[PDB]
Amino acid sequence: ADLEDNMETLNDNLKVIEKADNAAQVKDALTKMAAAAADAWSATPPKLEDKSPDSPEMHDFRHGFWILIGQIHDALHLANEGKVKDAQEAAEHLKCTCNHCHQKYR
Amino acid sequence: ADLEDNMETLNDNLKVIEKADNAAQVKDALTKMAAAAADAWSATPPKLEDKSPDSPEMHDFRHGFWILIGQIHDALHLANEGKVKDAQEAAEHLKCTCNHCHQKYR
Amino acid sequence: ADLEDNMETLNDNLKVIEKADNAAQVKDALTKMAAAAADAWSATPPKLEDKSPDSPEMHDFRHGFWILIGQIHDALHLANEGKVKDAQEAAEHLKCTCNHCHQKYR
Amino acid sequence: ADLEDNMETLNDNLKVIEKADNAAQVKDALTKMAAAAADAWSATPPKLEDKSPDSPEMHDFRHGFWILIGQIHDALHLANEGKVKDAQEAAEHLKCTCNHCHQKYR
Numbered sequence: 009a010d011l012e013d014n015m016e017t018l019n020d021n022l023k024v025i026e027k028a029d030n031a032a033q034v035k036d037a038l039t040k041m042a043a044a045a046a047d048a049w050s051a052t053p054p055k056l057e058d059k060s061p062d063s064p065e066m067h068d069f070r071h072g073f074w075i076l077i078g079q080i081h082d083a084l085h086l087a088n089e090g091k092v093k094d095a096q097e098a099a100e101h102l103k104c105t106c107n108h109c110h111q112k113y114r
Numbered sequence: 115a116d117l118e119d120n121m122e123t124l125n126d127n128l129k130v131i132e133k134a135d136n137a138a139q140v141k142d143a144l145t146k147m148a149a150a151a152a153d154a155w156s157a158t159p160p161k162l163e164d165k166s167p168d169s170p171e172m173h174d175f176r177h178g179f180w181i182l183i184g185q186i187h188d189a190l191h192l193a194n195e196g197k198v199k200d201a202q203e204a205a206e207h208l209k210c211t212c213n214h215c216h217q218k219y220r
Numbered sequence: 221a222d223l224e225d226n227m228e229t230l231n232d233n234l235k236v237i238e239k240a241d242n243a244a245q246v247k248d249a250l251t252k253m254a255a256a257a258a259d260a261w262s263a264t265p266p267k268l269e270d271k272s273p274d275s276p277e278m279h280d281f282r283h284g285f286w287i288l289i290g291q292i293h294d295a296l297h298l299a300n301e302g303k304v305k306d307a308q309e310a311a312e313h314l315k316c317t318c319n320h321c322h323q324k325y326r
Numbered sequence: 327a328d329l330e331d332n333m334e335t336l337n338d339n340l341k342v343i344e345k346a347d348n349a350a351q352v353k354d355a356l357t358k359m360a361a362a363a364a365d366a367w368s369a370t371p372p373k374l375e376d377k378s379p380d381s382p383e384m385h386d387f388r389h390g391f392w393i394l395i396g397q398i399h400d401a402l403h404l405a406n407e408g409k410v411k412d413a414q415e416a417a418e419h420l421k422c423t424c425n426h427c428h429q430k431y432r
């Protein structure tokens with residue numbers, strides 16, 4: 009899918025984790041996020057179209073998605089060990105990877 | 115020194131790193147931050163006075179300061195290897211430890 | 221492929237990185253390692269056959285492979301930025317994930 | 327104290343954590359280790375006497391001690407939350423910082 013599509017899958021799903029009553033609402037949401045950042049890894053932002061697919065500025069942009077995946081990964085372990093509030097908090101710490109990518113490439 | 119004193123040493127010094135023209139302005143600033151978070155480690159917040167000095171909520175609050183110190187530490191290595199922009203960016207990533215402590219204990 | 225097959229793909233390829241004269245010998249090798257640990261993630265060790273596929277002892281065993289993948293990942297960035305010795309060193313730091321899995325599950 | 331003194335405080339205390347029956351034997355030991363690596367931070371190895379106190383090879387050697395301190399730090403939190411086996415395991419993962427310093431500077 010489209011990048012904006014991915015980003016709007018991430019954002020609308022983080023709200024969901026935040027106002028969640030259910031573990032399986034967090035767990036579900038984080039999986040869609042994981043799959044959206046997986047898709048978004050192989051994707052070129054407006055601000056780096058002119059930069060090479062081997063650009064360091066493109067490596068770093070993709071590794072922002074690599075970090076987000078791992079952060080989401082450890083969040084999914086916590087939801088699966090029953091720690092629903094811990095998970096939501098892991099989920100809230102996503103936003104700093106989110107903003108790191110935005111400030112530097114949006 | 116007082117906690118608010120420390121926090122207002124941190125904040126007013128992060129602005130300084132952000133609008134900095136000099137390496138030694140970043141390097142200087144980060145050292146005052148380091149020393150302010152060092153002081154603030156041994157300090158009780160309003161919201162945990164009633165909680166024990168061995169409280170897990172007090173351990174975690176102090177370990178927020180432990181993380182910030184290390185983050186500031188790696189920022190000082192970068193300023194000392196000449197990487198002034200890298201440093202400022204390390205400095206900008208402080209804000210997520212900052213907000214993590216605030217959301218949960220301010 | 222088989223687990224032992226994977227492990228013997230990892231080991232024989234780490235020797236290769238260590239006595240390497242070429243960047244593309246490190247880079248090549250690390251990719252086979254990456255693919256071998258990817259395969260080995262979805263695999264059951266002798267010592268946990270009786271433990272559930274949702275066992276915490278099986279989660280942790282799989283997350284050992286998750287850590288190794290990321291370690292190998294950052295090793296591949298370094299080989300691709302020209303830092304062939306840095307890479308080999310990243311490669312040498314694999315062995316502690318290697319032994320952590322072995323001591324606890326071999 | 328002397329570096330060898332520190333190193334022989336670390337080693338003889340890691341054995342102690344490993345064959346420990348008591349939490350306060352782990353907790354005690356890790357504190358002596360912490361204090362020994364604190365001392366050893368401000369210390370020059372034989373192999374870098376000729377290198378500058380601002381050498382990158384001397385920065386990295388000292389930051390090896392910085393990493394070890396944090397590793398020991400998180401080990402002490404676990405001993406203080408009652409997780410005596412977790413602690414011993416944290417303690418066993420020290421050895422890779424230990425060997426990283428040795429291979430490169432002993």
Ligand code: HEC
Pocket residue numbers: 011012015016018019020022053054069070071072073076102103105106107109110113114
């Ligand atoms: C890069 C590695 C990114 C990470 C990590 C995250 N985001 Fe992102 N985001 C990124 C870009 C390049 C853009 C701009 C898209 C455009 O072409 O305009 C965005 C944008 C958003 C948006 C707005 C979408 C739009 O219509 O402009 C949202 C709502 C958004 N991003 C959310 C978001 C969330 C919730 C993240 C983490 C959980 C996150 N982003 C990480 C690049 C990257």
Ligand code: HEC
Pocket residue numbers: 117118121122124125126128159160175176177178179182208209211212213215216219220
């Ligand atoms: C805990 C581990 C904290 C970390 C890390 C940071 N801050 Fe903080 N901050 C903390 C508390 C408990 C408070 C409330 C103080 C009070 O008694 O009201 C604060 C407050 C601030 C403030 C406002 C001070 C005030 O007058 O209320 C600022 C400006 C501030 N903090 C800044 C700040 C910065 C810049 C940080 C990182 C670089 C940071 N804080 C981290 C607790 C903790």
Ligand code: HEC
Pocket residue numbers: 223224227228230231232234265266281282283284285288314315317318319321322325326
């Ligand atoms: C688990 C998460 C592991 C990680 C990470 C690594 N290894 Fe491993 N290894 C693992 C198991 C369960 C076993 C036993 C296989 C058996 O059924 O006997 C092994 C074994 C090996 C072996 C020996 C293979 C054999 O014939 O017994 C080697 C040579 C080996 N492992 C190498 C290796 C290397 C080089 C690693 C990191 C780079 C590594 N392993 C990580 C489980 C896990």
Ligand code: HEC
Pocket residue numbers: 329330333334336337338340371372387388389390391394420421423424425427428431432
């Ligand atoms: C550097 C950052 C180091 C870390 C981290 C650790 N060690 Fe070390 N160790 C270091 C040096 C430079 C030396 C050589 C001392 C000499 O002058 O010969 C050592 C040596 C040891 C020794 C042997 C002491 C001797 O008589 O030669 C031991 C037993 C030892 N180190 C143990 C040790 C342990 C247990 C560590 C982690 C828990 C560890 N070291 C880390 C430098 C560094």
Ligand SMILES: [Cl-]
Pocket residue numbers: 046049
């Ligand atoms: Cl991917």
Ligand SMILES: [Cl-]
Pocket residue numbers: 067070071072074
């Ligand atoms: Cl990447």
Ligand SMILES: [Cl-]
Pocket residue numbers: 039084
């Ligand atoms: Cl899952």
Ligand SMILES: [Cl-]
Pocket residue numbers: 152155
């Ligand atoms: Cl301190």
Ligand SMILES: [Cl-]
Pocket residue numbers: 173176177178180
């Ligand atoms: Cl702490």
Ligand SMILES: [Cl-]
Pocket residue numbers: 145190
């Ligand atoms: Cl300094």
Ligand SMILES: [Cl-]
Pocket residue numbers: 258261
């Ligand atoms: Cl996988």
Ligand SMILES: [Cl-]
Pocket residue numbers: 279282283284286
């Ligand atoms: Cl996993």
Ligand SMILES: [Cl-]
Pocket residue numbers: 251296
């Ligand atoms: Cl690659």
Ligand SMILES: [Cl-]
Pocket residue numbers: 364367
């Ligand atoms: Cl120190």
Ligand SMILES: [Cl-]
Pocket residue numbers: 385388389390392
């Ligand atoms: Cl250091």
Ligand SMILES: [Cl-]
Pocket residue numbers: 357402
């Ligand atoms: Cl202690």
